[PDB]
């Protein structure tokens, strides 16, 4: 916390890493202001490539996820939802998420740890990684147990992390 004023916030990314820290918040809240949105407070990470956006109510917050055409400083920001907690996570945990991966990382690479996994799905655009990797295990028990034990491996010289996330509803409903 020690920044946001409301409990309503969303995980944003692709805020361009060229301008200053407080120089990004402006644009972020700007683009939204054009979509009839109102932000109470905006936060930016240390890498100046991602951050969070706080909204007065869940309406404006969820609204941003509905609308489209969000970009600042030329680049197109990415809206997403942070980690949460709910009984739905039971099955939603079937799939694990990977982070701290290089722009040259590959599927087989991360598979070096969860090679026994069921399926692997990397996230790369323009012919380069984005810093993430989604994998669908056979069971949350075999997944959360593999990412919790394998976590700490070394790939491309760096140490890739491991986390779990199934995202909120709407995945199959909508």
UniProtKB/Swiss-Prot annotation:
It comes from the Eukaryota. The modification N6-acetyllysine is found at residues 19, 49, 78, 99, 104, 128, 145, 169. There is a cross-link at residues 25, 71, 78 (Glycyl lysine isopeptide (Lys-Gly) (interchain with G-Cter in SUMO2)). Its main location: nucleus. One of its GO terms (cellular component) is cornified envelope. GO terms for molecular function: DNA topoisomerase binding; identical protein binding; insulin receptor substrate binding; mRNA 5'-UTR binding; PH domain binding; RNA binding; telomeric DNA binding. The modification Phosphoserine is found at residues 57, 159, 161. The keyword Acetylation applies. Residues 8-84, 94-167 form the RRM domain. There is a cross-link at residue 25 (Glycyl lysine isopeptide (Lys-Gly) (interchain with G-Cter in SUMO1)). One of its GO terms (biological process) is negative regulation of insulin receptor signaling pathway. The keyword Cell cycle does not apply. The modification Phosphothreonine is found at residues 2, 68, 106. Some glutamate residues are glycylated by TTLL8. This modification occurs exclusively on glutamate residues and results in a glycine chain on the gamma-carboxyl group. Symmetrically methylated by PRMT5. It is found in: Nucleus, Nucleolus; Cytoplasm. Keywords: Acetylation, Cytoplasm, DNA-binding, Isopeptide bond, Methylation, Nucleus, Phosphoprotein, Repeat, RNA-binding, Ubl conjugation. Nucleolin is the major nucleolar protein of growing eukaryotic cells. It is found associated with intranucleolar chromatin and pre-ribosomal particles. It induces chromatin decondensation by binding to histone H1. It is thought to play a role in pre-rRNA transcription and ribosome assembly. May play a role in the process of transcriptional elongation. Binds RNA oligonucleotides with 5'-UUAGGG-3' repeats more tightly than the telomeric single-stranded DNA 5'-TTAGGG-3' repeats. Identified in a IGF2BP1-dependent mRNP granule complex containing untranslated mRNAs. Component of the SWAP complex that consists of NPM1, NCL/nucleolin, PARP1 and SWAP70. Component of a complex which is at least composed of HTATSF1/Tat-SF1, the P-TEFb complex components CDK9 and CCNT1, RNA polymerase II, SUPT5H, and NCL/nucleolin. Interacts with AICDA. Interacts with APTX. Interacts with C1QBP. Interacts with ERBB4. Interacts (via C-terminus) with FMR1 isoform 6 (via N-terminus). Interacts with GZF1; this interaction is important for nucleolar localization of GZF1. Interacts with NSUN2. This is Nucleolin. It comes from Homo sapiens. The lineage of its organism: Eukaryota, Metazoa, Chordata, Craniata, Vertebrata. The chain holds residues 300 to 468 of 710 of the full protein.
